């Protein structure tokens, strides 16, 4: 059942904010040459900078963000994998300026791209458990998780859900394996083996606007939870019903994903990924994706939808804290736009976030 099939043609129920929700938000380093309409109040910052981090930790507490997801490039690109950790260690060092109640923890958004896996080249291609032999790519796969487990074993600031370090895997539907559960159980056993029985909580991303069971064979027995990429990624052509009735579309799709993934045949948590806006035309004006302007009324309705789809994890993911390249950020802007006269969203979206996901 896809998006048209799952839209209920009637008002979305009100979901009250009664417990605190566990909110994670993607953290990024934007390209600052793009033509933004407003600018960050912390000013420009690169992957090498650290002065922005305290400001962002403050912003994050203003928003009720419990953890940031930072990119992790696979060890196959050695330099990029090194940088991924350097960035997080610089973040972690800035956490030492904060009390325990103000700490905003971290976790990784794992990118296996460098392994060169696709459908024709699975991660387990020459893996044979019975000759104790692993595909070269599976070795690297494992090493990427060992390195994460090592960071978490040694750093209480690595975000844990119920004692388990959280890992998000980008494009998890394309992590081609002849046997996804066997690959993941081998990796989990290797982590348990090396880190005193550590268990991980792995979130797998699927593409937006797609059925929640389309990629069961990639997720069932493999990951702990599934989410979609933001539904604010949408071709402006032939999407008339979806843009017009968006909040109802996402409500329909997410609550259905939460029900359907949660059946005993599958046994997977669903975690909604939300966005306040998007603009894919920033990186390239030929991107046909529709621009979602920031709209408070809409964003609150989306947050309500997400609350309608949350499960036992109590978890919601925000695309994004500061993914300015695609217009999804909530990072505090200056009070005026680049024109020097029009009011900008400022800190409005941090405050909305705390209202929509933390108990008053």
Binding site for Br ion (CB under 5 A): 1, 31, 49-51, 64, 211, 213, 283, 358
The Cα–Cα gap between 322 and 222 comes to 30
For residue 332, the Cα-to-chain-centroid distance in whole angstroms is 20
Nearer to Br ion (CB atom), residue 33 or residue 120: 33
In the bound state with Br ion, the residue whose beta carbon lies nearer, of 20 and 129, is 20
Residues 6+ apart with CB under 8 A from 74: 80, 81, 110, 111, 112, 113, 114, 115, 140, 141, 144
Distance, C-alpha 100 to centroid of its chain? 24
> Which is closer to Br ion, CB of 23 or CB of 166?
23
Query: What is the smallest separation between the CB atom of 142 and Br ion, expressed in angstroms?
Result: 20
Question: What is the b/e burial string over 222-240, where b = at least 16 CB atoms within 10 angstroms of the residue's CB?
Answer: bbbbbbbbbbbbbeeeebe
Closer to Br ion at the Cβ: 49 or 147? 49
Min dist. Cβ of residue 237 to Br ion (A): 23
Output the CA–CA distances (angstroms, integers) from residue 328 to 4, 94, 278, in the order listed.
25, 25, 5
Q: Where are the beta strands (DSSP E) in the chain?
A: 22-26, 67-73, 105-111, 160-161, 164-169, 201-206, 225-228, 269-270, 273-274, 315-318
Question: Considering the complex, what minimum distance in angstroms separates the CB of residue 137 from Br ion?
Answer: 28
Q: How far is the CB of 141 from Br ion (least distance, A)?
A: 25
- Based on CB atoms, which residue is closest to Br ion, 150 or 182? 150
Q: Which is nearer to Br ion, 213 or 302 (CB)?
A: 213
Q: How far is the CB of 282 from Br ion (least distance, A)?
A: 8
Query: What is the chain's length?
Result: 360
Q: Name the minimum Å distance from CB 156 to Br ion.
A: 19
């Amino acid at each position: 059942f896809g998006p048209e099939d799952t839209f209920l043609g009637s008002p979305i129920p009100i979901f009250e904010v009664n417990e605190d929700y566990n909110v994670g938000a993607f953290y990024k380093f934007p390209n600052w040459n793009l033509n933004y309409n407003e600018m960050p109040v912390s000013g420009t910052y690169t992957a090498a900078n650290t002065d922005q981090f305290p400001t962002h930790i403050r912003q994050a507490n203003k928003a009720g963000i419990n953890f940031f997801l930072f990119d992790l490039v696979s060890s196959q690109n050695a330099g990029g994998h090194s940088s991924s950790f350097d960035i997080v260690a610089r973040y972690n060092n800035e956490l030492a300026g904060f009390t325990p109640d103000s700490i905003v923890k971290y976790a990784f958004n794992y990118n296996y791209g460098p392994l060169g896996i696709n459908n024709n080249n699975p991660v387990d291609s020459t893996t044979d458990e019975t000759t104790n032999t692993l595909d070269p790519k599976e070795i690297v796969f494992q090493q990427d998780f060992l390195n994460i487990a090592d960071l978490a074993e040694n750093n209480t600031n690595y975000y844990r859900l119920d004692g388990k370090p959280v890992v998000y895997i980008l494009n998890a539907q394309n992590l081609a394996a002849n046997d996804s559960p066997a690959v993941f159980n081998r990796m989990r056993q290797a982590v348990r083996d090396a880190y005193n029985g550590m268990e991980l909580y792995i979130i797998g991303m699927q593409p937006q606007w797609q059925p929640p069971l389309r990629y069961d064979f990639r997720f069932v027995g493999a990951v702990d939870a599934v989410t979609h990429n933001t539904y604010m990624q949408l071709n402006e052509n032939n999407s008339y019903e979806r843009i017009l009735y968006f909040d109802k579309m996402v409500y329909g799709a997410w609550s259905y994903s939460q029900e359907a993934l949660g059946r005993s045949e599958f046994n997977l948590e669903y975690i909604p990924t939300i966005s306040p806006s998007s603009n894919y035309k920033l990186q390239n004006p030929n991107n046909q994706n529709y621009i979602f302007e920031k709209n408070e009324k809409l964003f609150r309705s989306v947050c309500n939808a997400a609350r309608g789809a949350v499960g036992e994890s109590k978890m919601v993911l925000l695309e994004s804290f500061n993914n300015w390249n695609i217009g999804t950020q909530i990072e505090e802007s200056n009070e005026l736009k680049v024109d020097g006269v029009t009011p900008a969203y400022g800190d409005q979206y941090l405050k909305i976030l705390k209202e929509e996901f933390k108990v008053a």
